[PDB]
Amino acid sequence: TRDQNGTWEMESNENFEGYMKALDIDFCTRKCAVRLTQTKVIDQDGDNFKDKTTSTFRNYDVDFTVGVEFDEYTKSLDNRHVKALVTWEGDVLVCVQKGEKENRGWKKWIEGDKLYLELTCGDQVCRQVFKKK
Amino acid sequence: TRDQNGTWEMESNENFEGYMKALDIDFCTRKCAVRLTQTKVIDQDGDNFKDKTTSTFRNYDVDFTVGVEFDEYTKSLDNRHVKALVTWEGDVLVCVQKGEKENRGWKKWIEGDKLYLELTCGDQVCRQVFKKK
Amino acid sequence: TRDQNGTWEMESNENFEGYMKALDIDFCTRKCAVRLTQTKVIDQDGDNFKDKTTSTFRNYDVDFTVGVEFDEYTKSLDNRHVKALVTWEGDVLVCVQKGEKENRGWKKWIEGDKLYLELTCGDQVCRQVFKKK
User: Chain C neighbours among B 43-82 (CB < 8 Å)?
Assistant: First the structure.
């Protein structure tokens, strides 16, 4: 159909970087842009168009059941394939991400009004704290 | 007026790059920052101020009529001047962006609840898919 | 507690950079990513989890009283420490940021429905305009 009216949210983006490089867009702009998603609003009246495009941060969703392994594609980071398995150790939620990187996984737990997250890959550990809203 | 209360949205930004260089901000941080807009919330009571600043992604508008050539400044990408012409090929919306780059243009079409966009410059082709919201 | 339900806003992040490096995340992405905060939404029923994580731009806050010098940590830009003093010159709000950078400060004023901001560091001046929302 020719009727392009609506709000449209990006779901896939292939070779955005090669296209941007052809436009001589700088190295830093290319790498940051290729991770963003976009929203296009198209306002169309016959053959007349008013278009609006805006970058947005991608939402990165993951669903799982404790004790049931699942395939995870780490699009929020390095976009690798891992086989992820989440277990309870007491009240600590523990995830092992089996794949190319050794000793990769995370631990997540609630203490008080705070969520604690420890991210591990190899010999590097990232430690994060979140406040409840 | 001394009364600065309100929410303020950026509409122009001159020499942000030179100011950031003087502050010795790294090339990469500068290229991400220079393209964003800002919102300032000012909460003022007499001479007491609570100020809030937040970066936001810029919205890029383009208006055209099918079959009517128009001057396009590709602000969302490489900020070049092109002579753009949009035509229908059946239900495919086709754009030729005549200018410094050879074989530059795009194709856009609706199939089902999805919008398809193909961006071309020279021998580089980027393919994007959007879902209706 | 095992009950991780809620919306969680990041408040601290330690060695995110080392973790991203271990994942082979590119230099540019690492530099822009460290400046972001994130919100995690957790929808949990027993051992079933639906998790959503989204990056967002940080809010940068400043509180001050006209005529009272204060310590300012310029996190939104170069992350320097300055001694800031804000004064009125007529209806123009004037700030001197005393510190490592010479001739550093800003001037801010309302004219009509617009906020004007002049940012100065050394011999570089950035000029910004905001419209009221």
Answer: 47-56
